[PDB]
Each structure stands twice: as structure tokens, then as C-alpha cells.
Design an enzyme around this catalytic site. Structure first.
Site, PDB file in Angstrom:
ATOM      1  N   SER E  30       0.813  -1.205   0.000  1.00 55.76           N
ATOM      2  CA  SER E  30       0.000   0.000   0.000  1.00 55.76           C
ATOM      3  C   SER E  30       0.850   1.260   0.000  1.00 55.76           C
ATOM      4  CB  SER E  30      -0.973   0.023   1.171  1.00 55.76           C
ATOM      5  OG  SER E  30      -2.063  -0.822   0.888  1.00 55.76           O
ATOM      6  N   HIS E  88       1.860   2.832  -8.261  1.00 56.86           N
ATOM      7  CA  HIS E  88       3.046   2.089  -8.646  1.00 56.86           C
ATOM      8  C   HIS E  88       3.173   2.065 -10.170  1.00 56.86           C
ATOM      9  CE1 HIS E  88       3.843   0.676  -4.596  1.00 56.86           C
ATOM     10  NE2 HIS E  88       2.698   0.020  -4.519  1.00 56.86           N
ATOM     11  N   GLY E  89       4.374   1.757 -10.638  1.00 58.75           N
ATOM     12  CA  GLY E  89       4.494   1.444 -12.047  1.00 58.75           C
ATOM     13  C   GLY E  89       5.894   0.990 -12.371  1.00 58.75           C
ATOM     14  N   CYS E 130       6.953   4.798  -9.945  1.00 62.25           N
ATOM     15  CA  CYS E 130       8.276   4.273 -10.237  1.00 62.25           C
ATOM     16  C   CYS E 130       8.381   3.966 -11.722  1.00 62.25           C
ATOM     17  CB  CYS E 130       8.552   3.003  -9.419  1.00 62.25           C
ATOM     18  SG  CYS E 130       8.814   3.236  -7.638  1.00 62.25           S
TER      19      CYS E 130
END
Lengths: 139, 93, 5, 91, 140, 5
Positions: E30, E88-89, E130
Site C-alpha cells: 500500500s 506504482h508502475g 516508479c
């Protein structure tokens, strides 16, 4: 604020102008790039840069050229400019005989890897394809 | 008190990610043509980032591919500034 | 005439 | 005509290929810095100069703090990607 | 002509996608702190006079569909268009609460030929995510 | 404390 530009020299400008490739590669000869490489020389001369034209390099002369420039003492120069004119594709520049990773060329100038240039503007002008999509416009 | 190692790089691509870059066989490439003209015109009035924005508009609005190959004809180009700079950049005093 | 890089 | 890809601006929080950093209570480094810099300058400054000031703030003022040494003392530089064709002012 | 025409009746939309909680099957933690960001974004762009639409914990399906619908509104009376993604990535990729989405697909809804009410107007994308796993150790 | 995205 602004970067410091009142150093003694404004900085090196490296032009790598590749127009003829090896036949084993089968990419075309890039006509007009000389017009480009000459326009660059005159313009940066007016920005007071120590311009250095290089012509038709293998993918290895490029790496090695860049490595040499990275280990020069830049302590009295304001900035650093590099121009690359060649065929390409996303992330990749073409020497006269085949591809080089872009990050490979630029890594020589990282903050930990080129101290005399730490904190100073490193500019990279790239004229090269980044793939094979086409823009058809609108209106 | 340090700074990131990729910091203070600028990447001025002639074209967007994934796309062809256009060059004229007699006059040179659209991008370098437009870059040198804009630098000639504006490097004693404008901060670099703005010069390249003008270079974007010159290429964007004034250039269109001309080919005997209908595949590569009537095509457009948008250049790509990738700035990890941390200060403004001026070429004059 | 205009060509691809 | 204009290129269908023209007039996009991508403001990445970090260099291509790198982690981005977020503080568990304060927010991500990039968005704290972007909001501070817009609050301070959106009526005096063009957008690229604001985002360039975001780069300096992130780059010089933040350093990752982690109990996992692998992720500790790490830095971030944001990434402005502009296919814009004009300058941008919020007034 | 050197500046985007900005005195349209409206500044434009400011879409905020605030993905805080992911399904465990993705193996992603999370994102503690993102609510502070989503709120700092709201107040800051409300002072610039945008129409902020906050959205929370969208799946990859929800995100493609949200973007599709927004690109089909009439932006005729709007100056610019902002979109913030918090998630996120990896490189090229942003995460819905159940999996990755290619960025090219979110943005392509707003190409100059795909959303005419925004042709010639600035389309901004702020991305907190990211882009890979390399670490900047710096230099003093 | 600081974390990765």
C-alpha cells in the site's frame, strides 16, 4: 536561479556526424547531414563553444571518443554539449557499423563519473529515429 | 548534502518516442534546421527551455514530409525535450 | 525531398 | 496540420528506469515539491521554469531514509518531457 | 502565439487518480502518504481555478474507461487539461488496483486527431510512479 | 519514513 556561465570557457561542443554506413548494415547514406553538421558548427561558434566535428565513426570509435572526452579536465568550462546525427531507434544510436545504447554514451558524464562536470549542464541534441511510427497530423 | 547522479542532463530529441525523424536531402534535418535558426534568433533574449519550445513550434507547424512514396508523404514531426536540469540556462550575460 | 532517419 | 502527438507535456517524478520515492506521512517527494512550487510561482513564472524549480528542490533537498540499507540514502531527479509548442502561464 | 491561449471561460479539468490500495494478487504494497498528495493536489489546482475531479482506487479497467469518457466530453470552452496519476508502475506502465496499464493507452485518447475539442491546447500529465528499479546513490 | 513506488 541560473546555472553559472561566467567560467573562462563556455565548454566543449562535440558533433558526431555519421552519413555513410557499412554495406553489411544496409541502411542508407544520410544526405543533408553535412548541411546539418555545418549549421551546428557555425551556431555554437557564436555561442563561444569549442566545437569539435567528428565524421563517420564506428560504434566503437563513438564509445571510445566519448570516454576520452569524459576524462578531460572540465574544471574551467561552463557547460557540455554533444550533438549526434545518425540513424536510430528508441534508446539506440547507430555507429557506422551498428547500434550503441544511448545510456552507455551518457553514463560517462554522470555526477559520480565525471567530477569536473558535476553540477553543470550536460546537453544532448539527438537527430535520429526513435522507431517507426508515423504522425499523420490533424486539421 | 549530495545531488542525484542523473541530474543536470538535458535530452533534446528531434522527435517523439517511437517515431521516425525527418531529414531533407538538400537542406538538412527539420530539427537541426529549426534548432540552429531558433538559437541564432533568440539566444540573447530567451532561456534555453523556451528556445526549444519555439523549435517545437517551428517543426510542428512549418514542416511536412514530401515523398514520392505515399506511405511517407504528408507526415508530421514533434520534437521531444527531456530535461533533468535544475537551473535556468542562459547563453548571454 | 524528405527521407526517414 | 499539427502532429497528433504535439501539445502533450509529461511531468515524470523520476528519471527513466529509476525508483520514485514517497514519504509515508508527508507524501511523495515530487508532489510535495510540485505543489509548493506552484503555490509560490504560478503567477510569476512559466510552467517549465516552475518544473525546473521542482527538479532542483527534489534533487537537492530530499534523501531517502530507510531501515533497509538497500533503499537508504538514495536520491531522485524528476523528468520533464515536453512536446509542447508554446509557453504556458496560469493567468 | 508564443503562449497558449489561457483565457477561455474555464481552465479545464484536473483529473486526479489516487490509487492507494492494491489487490494482494499483484504483489504490491500500500502507498501510505498518497492521500496527503491527492489533497495537496486538490487544494493547489483549485487555487489555479481548475475543475478537480478526485478519484480513488480504480482498477485498470476503470482507468481506461474513465479516460475514454473524459476525452469524449466537449472541451470547447476549456483552456487546458490536467491529469495526475499516483500509483506504482514500471517504465511505460501505470498500475490499476489489479494490474498494469500501458501509459500510451491513457494518453492516446487525447491525441490531436482523437479529441478535437482539445486540439492545440496543452494536455498535461503529472506522474508519481516508479519507472524501474535502479537507485541513484548520488555524489556529494 | 521513505518508501518506493
Amino acid at each position: 536561479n541560473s546555472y553559472k556561465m561566467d567560467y573562462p570557457e563556455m565548454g566543449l561542443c562535440i558533433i558526431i556526424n555519421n552519413k555513410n554506413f557499412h554495406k553489411s548494415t544496409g541502411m542508407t547514406s544520410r544526405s543533408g547531414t553535412d548541411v546539418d553538421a555545418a549549421n551546428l558548427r557555425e551556431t555554437f561558434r557564436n555561442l563561444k563553444y569549442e566545437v569539435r566535428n567528428k565524421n563517420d565513426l564506428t560504434r566503437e570509435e563513438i564509445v571510445e571518443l566519448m570516454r576520452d572526452v569524459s576524462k578531460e579536465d572540465h574544471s574551467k568550462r561552463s557547460s557540455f554539449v554533444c550533438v549526434l546525427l545518425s540513424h536510430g531507434e528508441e534508446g539506440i544510436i547507430f555507429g557506422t557499423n551498428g547500434p550503441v545504447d544511448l545510456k552507455k554514451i551518457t553514463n560517462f558524464f554522470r555526477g559520480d563519473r565525471c567530477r569536473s562536470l558535476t553540477g553543470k549542464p550536460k546537453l544532448f541534441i539527438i537527430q535520429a529515429c526513435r522507431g517507426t511510427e508515423l504522425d499523420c497530423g490533424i486539421e | 548534502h549530495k545531488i542525484p547522479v542523473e541530474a543536470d542532463f538535458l535530452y533534446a530529441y528531434s522527435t517523439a518516442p517511437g517515431y521516425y525523424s525527418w531529414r531533407n536531402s538538400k537542406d538538412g534535418s527539420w530539427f537541426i534546421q529549426s534548432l540552429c535558426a531558433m538559437l541564432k534568433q533568440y539566444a540573447d533574449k530567451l532561456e534555453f527551455m523556451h528556445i526549444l519550445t519555439r523549435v517545437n513550434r517551428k517543426v510542428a507547424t512549418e514542416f511536412e514530409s514530401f515523398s514520392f512514396d505515399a506511405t511517407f508523404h504528408a507526415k508530421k514531426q514533434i520534437p521531444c525535450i527531456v530535461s533533468m536540469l535544475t537551473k535556468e540556462l542562459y547563453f548571454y550575460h | 525531398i524528405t527521407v526517414a532517419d
